[PDB]
């Protein structure tokens, strides 16, 4: 992914490709689009946004009062 | 050791102020409190923290009474008044080591509080209630702390037009308890009816025979009840009956309280409105009606519009407005530091410590916002020397009423006084 | 108990990815506690996440694409 974003803004590429995934069944690095693993955008956006919502409320507690 | 018993209460009081200090501002740190009954509540409001904290310390409970009067009078600053109270207690710790009796410490706070008000009014811009353009933008900024934003534009003239009718002139204290926020299920935020006469909490009779509407009603046309046969008896006499009146509204209706009495239901409400009381002794009590679909709508809206009425209440009792964010507290500490040489004796040293105790409020605002503590405070004394009230919060639409800053210092002078005046405590029953 | 309501929030709507949300929120708390020795203010940590969260969605929206590679390649074949 390092060399994939170097030529990305230049709008020109030769051996640089994006969307490199991880295939644990065959133990090799292949694109998840052709591998058959696809997920919707709504599931990923709401999962990342809600993950930070619960993390803020934890860091804001400096005191625990229990009777 | 009569003084050592009081010093133990001062240290316990400073620990409570330091806990609330982290909760100041919208970026402050929340506090988790677990009640003995099992209820788990959390929030940054200092009034709700001290209410459910169940403090068993006798002196520390004074902050609860001050926070209750802070919301009842000014309506804002319940968190900042606790920090200002703990600042005078921390400065008084070094005063006891020098052999200073708390009477001089308490008496000097009366002259320091009255002097701080006169200095604050010199830099404050006096405003009048006849200008409706200033009151709209004043209440709209208080609604920016809630989820409702685009729908808050129509809520600004609702609170402004209600106070101006009952403001008149030289009204002094204006009780907001007479203004009731009606929360009903259904509707939207943009749908609101003022109904300046009065608004009840209950519906009408859904049975047969009830007129539900009457013209020129008080020969009793309409009655209130705190049998099915009694409804049929009064139906022939053309007498409207409204039962199931809440006990909490009994004292409310005895204060504010007809040309026309009708029942208008937008959606599902089935509410009766009254207009044109025209009573000589009784004034024009207005009850605000709030409509919403979900329960979280009318709830968060209730606390948002209540704080907006408190800001307007401050302008009615005391005219003028200042910029918030600890801006005036910096210049007050600068003027009192130079004027401290005009005094003589032990009281002269108190003016120097009183100026340093006022800088804790702007310092906490810079700490809870992530900015450097000491670095931002140094920039306040630098910019406020050449300019006056120019730092820019006016462009950011941050306006704090002058009565909040005045009541915060006034209530702190009486709160710290009631502390140091207690030299001992014993079991009394 | 905050993670309990967080797990039920994803199940009542998306119903998938609840395990990945807990792991992300767990690592953020471990790295935030290490910044205490660095004198890092927690609000700056919170503000740094809110600013990066809105900018990360814009970067994700740039690489999003609909169903493609229908001619010359195969996509939905390897799913089944």
UniProtKB/Swiss-Prot annotation, chain B:
Keywords: ATP-binding, Chaperone, Cytoplasm, Nucleotide-binding. The keyword Amino-acid biosynthesis does not apply. SUPFAM superfamilies: GroEL apical domain-like, GroEL equatorial domain-like, GroEL-intermediate domain like. GO terms for cellular component: chaperonin-containing T-complex. PROSITE patterns: TCP1_1, TCP1_2, TCP1_3. InterPro entries: Chap_CCT_delta (IPR012717), Chaperone_TCP-1 (IPR017998), Chaperonin_TCP-1_CS (IPR002194), Cpn60/GroEL/TCP-1 (IPR002423), GroEL-like_apical_dom_sf (IPR027409), GROEL-like_equatorial_sf (IPR027413), TCP-1-like_intermed_sf (IPR027410), TCP-1_chaperonin (IPR053374). It is found in: Cytoplasm. GO terms for biological process: chaperone mediated protein folding independent of cofactor; protein folding. GO terms for molecular function: ATP binding; ATP hydrolysis activity; ATP-dependent protein folding chaperone; unfolded protein binding. Its main location: cytoplasm. Coiled coil: none annotated. It comes from the Eukaryota. Pfam families: Cpn60_TCP1. Molecular chaperone; assists the folding of proteins upon ATP hydrolysis. Known to play a role, in vitro, in the folding of actin and tubulin. In yeast may play a role in mitotic spindle formation. Belongs to the TCP-1 chaperonin family. PANTHER family: CHAPERONIN (PTHR11353). Heterooligomeric complex of about 850 to 900 kDa that forms two stacked rings, 12 to 16 nm in diameter. Present with 5530 molecules/cell in log phase SD medium. This is T-complex protein 1 subunit delta. It comes from Saccharomyces cerevisiae (strain ATCC 204508 / S288c). The gene is CCT4.
Curated annotation (Swiss-Prot), chain C:
It is found in: Cytoplasm. Belongs to the TCP-1 chaperonin family. Heterooligomeric complex of about 850 to 900 kDa that forms two stacked rings, 12 to 16 nm in diameter. Molecular chaperone; assists the folding of proteins upon ATP hydrolysis. Known to play a role, in vitro, in the folding of actin and tubulin. In yeast may play a role in mitotic spindle formation. This is T-complex protein 1 subunit alpha. It comes from Saccharomyces cerevisiae (strain ATCC 204508 / S288c). The lineage of its organism: Eukaryota, Fungi, Dikarya, Ascomycota, Saccharomycotina. The chain holds residues 81 to 160 of 559 of the full protein.
């Amino acid at each position: 992914h390092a060399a994939s974003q170097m030529a990305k803004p230049e709008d020109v590429k030769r051996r640089s490709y994006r969307n490199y995934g991880l295939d644990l069944i065959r133990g090799k690095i292949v694109d998840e689009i052709h591998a058959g693993v696809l997920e919707p955008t709504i599931s990923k956006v709401k999962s990342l946004k809600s993950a930070l919502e619960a993390c803020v409320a934890i860091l804001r507690i400096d005191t625990m009062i229990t009777v | 050791k009569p003084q050592e018993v009081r010093k133990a209460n001062i240290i316990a009081a400073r620990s409570v102020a330091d806990a609330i200090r982290t909760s100041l501002g919208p970026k402050g740190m929340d506090k988790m409190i677990k009640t003995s009954r099992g209820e788990i509540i959390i929030s940054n409001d200092g009034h709700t923290i001290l209410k459910q904290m169940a403090i068993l310390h006798p002196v520390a409970r004074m902050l609860v009474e001050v926070s209750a009067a802070q919301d009842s009078e000014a309506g804002d600053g319940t968190t900042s008044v606790v920090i200002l109270t703990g600042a005078l207690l921390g400065a008084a710790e070094r005063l006891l080591n020098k052999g200073i009796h708390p009477t001089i410490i308490a008496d000097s706070f009366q002259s320091a509080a009255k002097r701080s008000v006169d200095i604050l009014l010199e830099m404050c811009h006096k405003v009048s209630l006849s200008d409706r353009e200033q009151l709209v933008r004043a209440a709209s900024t208080s609604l920016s702390s809630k989820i409702v934003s685009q729908y808050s534009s129509f809520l600004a003239p609702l609170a402004v037009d209600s106070v101006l009718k009952i403001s008149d002139e030289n009204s002094k204290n204006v009780d907001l308890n007479d203004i009731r926020l009606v929360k009903k299920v259904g509707g939207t935020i943009d749908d609101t009816e003022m109904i300046d006469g009065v608004v009840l909490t209950q519906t009408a009779i859904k049975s047969a025979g009830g007129p539900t509407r009457k013209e020129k009603a008080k020969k009793c046309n309409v009655l209130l009840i705190q049998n099915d046969l009694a409804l049929h008896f009064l139906s022939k006499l053309n007498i409207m009956v409204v039962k199931d009146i809440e006990r909490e509204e009994i004292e409310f209706l005895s204060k504010g309280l007809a040309d026309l009495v009708e029942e208008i239901d937008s959606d599902g409400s089935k509410i009766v409105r009254v207009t044109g009381i025209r009573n000589n002794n009784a004034r024009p009590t207005v009850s605000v009606v709030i409509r919403g679909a979900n329960n979280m709508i009318i709830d968060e809206t209730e606390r948002s519009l209540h704080d907006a009425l408190c800001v307007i209440r401050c302008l009615v009792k005391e005219r003028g407005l200042i910029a918030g964010g600890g801006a005036p507290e910096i210049e007050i500490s600068r003027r009192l530091s130079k004027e401290a040489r005009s005094m003589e004796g032990v009281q002269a040293f108190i003016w120097q410590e009183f100026a340093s105790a006022l800088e804790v409020i702007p310092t906490t605002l810079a700490e809870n916002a992530g900015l450097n503590s000491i670095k931002v405070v140094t920039e306040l004394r630098s910019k406020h020397e050449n300019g006056e009230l120019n730092d820019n919060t006016y462009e950011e639409h941050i306006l704090q009423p002058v009565l909040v800053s005045t009541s915060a210092i006034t209530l702190a002078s009486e709160c710290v006084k009631s502390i140091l005046r207690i030299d001992d405590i014993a079991f009394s029953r | 108990k905050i993670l309990v309501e967080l797990a039920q929030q994803q199940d009542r709507e998306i119903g998938d990815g609840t395990t990945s949300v807990v792991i992300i929120a767990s690592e953020l708390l471990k790295r935030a506690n290490e910044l205490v020795k660095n004198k890092i203010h927690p609000t700056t940590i919170i503000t740094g996440f809110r600013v990066a969260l809105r900018e990360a969605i814009r970067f994700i929206n740039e690489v999003l694409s609909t169903s493609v590679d229908t001619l010359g390649k195969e996509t939905l074949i390897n799913i089944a």
